[PDB]
Amino acid sequence: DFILNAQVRSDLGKGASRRLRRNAGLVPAVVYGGDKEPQSVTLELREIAKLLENEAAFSHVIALNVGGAKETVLIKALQRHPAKGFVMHADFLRVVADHKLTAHVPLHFINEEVAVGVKQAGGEISHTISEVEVSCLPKDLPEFIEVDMAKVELGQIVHLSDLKAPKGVELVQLAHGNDLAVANIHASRV
Amino acid sequence: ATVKVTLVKSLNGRLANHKACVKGLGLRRINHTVEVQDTPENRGMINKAYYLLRVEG
Amino acid sequence: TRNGRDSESKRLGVKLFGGQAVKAGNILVRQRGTKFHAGYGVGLGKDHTLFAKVDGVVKFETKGAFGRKYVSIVAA
């Protein structure tokens, strides 16, 4: 499932990283977090890009196998080529059982077709945001947060306070007194 | 202790900074070899003009 | 065109850099306003020129509140 193999990287810099991408088909990467000194690793380009196609590739914990050592890890950030779109770099956050981790989690809009604002009012559905930033312990990190639009009329706004998170999950942005909009129903363009 | 240094390329058209690095080692013309002590001051002129020289060691 | 005007340059800036030996009356900075402030042993002219009142070397330090930049003279 979510398993990666990586090797230790000892050659650093602009020149060494360019030779990894050009002549070896590898990707530089870093593992930090927990309570340890950070470590520099390297991994296959065609291996990381295959896992990224999975929907829950950023809201799931991954078993990283560096050398023979196995440790549990979550994907924190990801650098991509601005034009071609492939991954150039990635950093990995170590996972500890009792410590809060702050991650991005995708949303799921269900039963959009039965929306009250759609069938009767004839209005469109617009998703203002498609992912939300959460914070929780690893044991209760969800693969997605599910938002329904069954009881939504025309002109109605869905906010962060409206949707409900699983037990032990906190919405970060809502804590800072900012409930940004999630979705709405509006009149047709024409 | 010391190090072989040999001038293999011409000095014509080089940067004035690089001409003084070759002259500071005692090199006069192509295929001419000198003895210079391996000190950080002498190494710095060798590195600045690395492409004009052959360092046998 | 109605643009072809300009004024002659004034040759401002730092005249003596940090660590240089100085003598009394030496001009250190030419300024508009006070980018640098007169530290110990340094006087200020009416066009904000910084000059040396004693002998020593330039120090240049950012200290105090307001984050000001000071030029002072210290004994070598």
Partner: protein, 137 residues
């Protein structure tokens, strides 16, 4: 067309267009986007021409964003005029494009309808483009 309501200065130096677009290279609002893969500049008549060719093909719902704004004035010297005698007058407004910049966005349509409509828009633009999808990171 598109141009600033007012500007601090009437003219600008030509400058240079270098680098990649690290900022503005994500699908920030919609689900699909048209992204530039070569460097050039759009003249605010190609932007309007490509917008009308894009919204017409949909004609049923959907939200459309434009992420490029022409804010650089360019001059032109009239015919039969010698060199010098001051800078020329402003004729049109342009936007600098670096490789990897998102040009248009759309949501509320199928992937195939967006893919067909962005093909029509790309035929009015003087630079290479590509079709991309929104991702978390």
């Amino acid at each position: 067309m598109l141009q600033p309501k007012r500007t601090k200065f009437r003219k600008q130096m030509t400058g240079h267009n270098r680098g990649l677009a690290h900022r503005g290279s994500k699908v920030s609002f919609g689900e699909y986007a048209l992204k530039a893969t070569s460097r050039g500049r759009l003249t605010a008549r190609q932007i309007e021409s490509a917008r009308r060719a894009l919204t017409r093909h949909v004609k049923r719902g959907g939200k459309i964003w434009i992420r490029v704004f022409p804010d650089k004035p360019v001059t032109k010297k009239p015919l039969e005029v010698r060199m010098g005698k001051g800078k020329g007058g402003v004729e049109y407004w342009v936007a600098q494009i670096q490789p990897g910049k998102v040009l248009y966005e759309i949501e509320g349509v199928s992937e195939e309808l967006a893919r067909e409509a962005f093909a029509l828009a790309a035929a009015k633009l003087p630079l290479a483009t590509s079709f991309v999808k929104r991702t978390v990171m």
